Structure 1
Amino acid sequence: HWGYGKHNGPEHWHKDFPIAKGERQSPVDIDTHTAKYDPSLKPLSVSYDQATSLRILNNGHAFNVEFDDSQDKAVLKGGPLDGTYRLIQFHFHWGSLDGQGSEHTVDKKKYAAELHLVHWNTKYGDFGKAVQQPDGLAVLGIFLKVGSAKPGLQKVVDVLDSIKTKGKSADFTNFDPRGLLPESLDYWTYPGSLTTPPLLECVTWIVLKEPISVSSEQVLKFRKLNFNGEGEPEELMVDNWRPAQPLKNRQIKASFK
């Protein structure tokens, strides 16, 4: 089916997901000189103190760390958002080389990877309903640059050997996602979409200004994962990113000057 190869990648997706050519597609390039500071944007409220991680899964496109979203345990509020968004999972997109891998770009700069913390608007009851709504999701996006190691990422790196191939999962309880954040919560925000099929236009994107630093060894271990299932020819899971899409009739707002 769809993927990231030459024969099933982002240039092909529109044939089965025509919204790929829609009016609010993600990711986008963040032109920092064209984004407008909005002094009415509130601070983000990230409340992960009670987060309950469950499992890590290689789904053939990335790996997801999944959370208990049956109660308000780990929630995102504030910023541009109305209402409460529950954390359901996080995942990454990354490159084959340190100079590429992020989906969003900043003044056309690509980061080595991008973390997506996916939340859904609790007024819609469940995630499947939320993705059908224009304000159903809020994804907190965080850039990764290669430099010093991120201690809060190491527990994720440690377990990747056990989920090398598509369909493999492992217990991943008691993981604190607060260890994945930068110091500052300054952000850009704009209305967009899922960056993989079904490409639904349901996401308020909140992209942090400050990248996190991860070590070359940490991202190298990302690149040892496999797109393929066990017993199939090995295809390294690398370059699972969609390139920047036309901004069209949208304005990116900044919470900071």
Structure 2
Amino acid sequence: HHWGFGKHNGPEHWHKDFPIAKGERQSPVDIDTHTAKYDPSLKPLSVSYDQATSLRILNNGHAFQVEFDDSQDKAVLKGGPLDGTYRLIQFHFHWGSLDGQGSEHTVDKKKYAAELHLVHWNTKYGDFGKAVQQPDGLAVLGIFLKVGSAKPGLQKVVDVLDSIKTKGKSADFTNFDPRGLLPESLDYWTYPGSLTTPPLLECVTWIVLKEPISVSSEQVLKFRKLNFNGEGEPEELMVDNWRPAQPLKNRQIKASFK
């Protein structure tokens, strides 16, 4: 009876196994655009993905994750609110059963159809496992998805999902360029928060882009054909794998733009 997104093990239950669920810097949060302060010290976000090396895509039982070779400085995030260099390790999404919900962060209470997380770890901690034990261990770049025109750069991801339908399935996924998932503007909000799946560690500097990317209805529909369950088990569609907004508590969200 482990954590999940069902009726008996979903986000409202997680605190029982992971008490930090009720912590002081939990994510996601609602971004109140009128309360976020423009910060004239925030540098432009530097995203250097030209040498990114994807390896594999995995159905991990709550989402799918595209993993990268992070053994060299190849795909790095720096600048913005960050000190130092953070290396890309994986990206994954959160999505809904319907276009009207699916994002984890919300903007003035608005829910998007999905949310992309590009997860990076602080190179000063040597690897991901050590980084998540530190308050500044991770930087996660969050990008909202809305349903409209197709995102061509996403299609290679959508087309491989049939091969990883059920929990535990993985597939070779090389030469995928995550630059094809970025919106035009890198304007962002930033605040200190946490992983949004257990163990919910409070190790993340969140950088959430203001500009959503558009994906097609057909693209998001294919996300919804994935399964939470393993092969040979009763079918449960992988939908609504998003944690709802958590109390902001003692935190200020800063904006890179006015």
**What's the TM-score once normalised by structure 2's chain length?**
0.99
Unpaired stretches in structure 2, ≥5 consecutive residues: none
- Secondary structure at the counterpart of residue 154 of structure 2: helix
Once residues 235 and 11 of structure 2 are traced to their aligned partners in structure 1, the CA distance between those partners, rounded to angstroms, is: 21
Shift of the alpha carbon at 1:221?
Answer: 0.1
Shift of the alpha carbon at 1:158?
Answer: 0.5
- Secondary structure at the counterpart of residue 54 of structure 1: strand
Once residues 131 and 122 of structure 1 are traced to their aligned partners in structure 2, the CA distance between those partners, rounded to angstroms, is: 12
Shift of the alpha carbon at 1:166?
Answer: 0.2
Once residues 39 and 97 of structure 1 are traced to their aligned partners in structure 2, the CA distance between those partners, rounded to angstroms, is: 38
Query: Number of paired residues?
Result: 257
Once residues 5 and 106 of structure 2 are traced to their aligned partners in structure 1, the CA distance between those partners, rounded to angstroms, is: 18
- Cα-to-partner distance string for 1:33-69 (whole Å, 9 max, x where unaligned): 0000001100000000000000000000100000000
- Cα-to-partner distance string for 1:69-97 (whole Å, 9 max, x where unaligned): 00000000000000000000000000000
- Cα-to-partner distance string for 1:162-197 (whole Å, 9 max, x where unaligned): 000000000000000000000000000000000010
Once residues 150 and 205 of structure 1 are traced to their aligned partners in structure 2, the CA distance between those partners, rounded to angstroms, is: 24
The runs of 4+ residues in structure 1 deviating greater than 4 Å are: none
Shift of the alpha carbon at 1:6?
Answer: 1.1
- 1:95-114 matched pairs, under 5 angstroms: 95-114=96-115
- 1:148-167 matched pairs, under 5 angstroms: 148-167=149-168
Question: How large is the Cα RMSD of the aligned pairs?
Answer: 0.3
Once residues 234 and 6 of structure 1 are traced to their aligned partners in structure 2, the CA distance between those partners, rounded to angstroms, is: 15
Once residues 119 and 191 of structure 2 are traced to their aligned partners in structure 1, the CA distance between those partners, rounded to angstroms, is: 15
- Cα-to-partner distance string for 1:222-247 (whole Å, 9 max, x where unaligned): 00000000000000000000000000
Shift of the alpha carbon at 1:124?
Answer: 0.2
- Identity in percent: 99
Once residues 40 and 195 of structure 2 are traced to their aligned partners in structure 1, the CA distance between those partners, rounded to angstroms, is: 27
Once residues 138 and 221 of structure 1 are traced to their aligned partners in structure 2, the CA distance between those partners, rounded to angstroms, is: 28
Once residues 189 and 130 of structure 1 are traced to their aligned partners in structure 2, the CA distance between those partners, rounded to angstroms, is: 19
- Cα-to-partner distance string for 1:184-218 (whole Å, 9 max, x where unaligned): 00000000000010000000000000000000000
